[PDB]
Amino acid sequence: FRAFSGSGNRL
Amino acid sequence: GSNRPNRLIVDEAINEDNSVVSLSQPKMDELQLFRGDTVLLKGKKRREAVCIVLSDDTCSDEKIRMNRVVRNNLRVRLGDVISIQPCPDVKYGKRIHVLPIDDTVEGITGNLFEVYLKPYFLEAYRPIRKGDIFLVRGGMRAVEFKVVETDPSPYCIVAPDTVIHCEGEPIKRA
């Protein structure tokens, strides 16, 4: 982990 | 500003929602608050929460109804005192990062975004603050997530275009 690592997810 | 004293005594919720607190109509009118307004709640030691305010005809004028989740975020108990103030124009989040609390996800299988976060946030325009812990129902068991970061920081609306990050190691309970 560090903040906003990766692509995330969309609602 | 209304110029009026803005301290209220913490009381229990009737409808459990993590993002809502309730006042009497007279108190809403005293403080120039409308239903659905974003408000900033303050406890001691810089503890804060952002909620929406609703009006409840059973709430005592000098009390504020808030659920256990919000009370824990403010580090208060029933009967303790908080302050409430307007928090206008909270910006829509670009992105947020949340992580589950370890003892709430131990052994779990399954996508935490699909089961828990997506239904929680979908089209709900929830306000949230860095450092919040919030409880989500779903699947077999309720999961607690910590808000590790928001952008903008420290609070935002989790809007349809807000990207939701949840990768990383679950967090220890504090």
Numbering used by the authors:
A (entry chain B): 225 to 235
B (entry chain A): 19 to 192
Please share excerpts from the published article on this structure.
p97, also known as VCP (valosin-containing protein), is a hexameric ATPase of type II AAA+ family. Thus, the functional diversity of p97 is realized through interactions with many different adaptor proteins, which are primarily recruited to the N-terminal domain, although some adaptors also bind the C-terminal tail.
In this initial report, we present the crystal structure of the complex between the p97 N domain and the Ufd1 SHP box at a high resolution of 1.55 Å. The current crystal structure further reveals that the Ufd1SHP (225-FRAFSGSGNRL-235) binds only the Nc lobe, consistent with the recent report. This short β-strand, βSHP, binds to β11 at the outer edge of the central four-stranded β-sheet (β8-β9-β7-β11) of the Nc subdomain, thereby extending it to a five-stranded sheet (β8-β9-β7-β11-βSHP: four strands from p97N and one strand from Ufd1SHP). Two glycine residues (Gly230 and Gly232) generate a sharp kink in the middle of the SHP box, thereby enabling the bending of Ufd1SHP upon binding to p97N. Mutating the Ufd1SHP residues reduced the binding affinity to an undetectable level in the ITC experiment, and mutating the p97N residues also abolished most of the binding affinity.
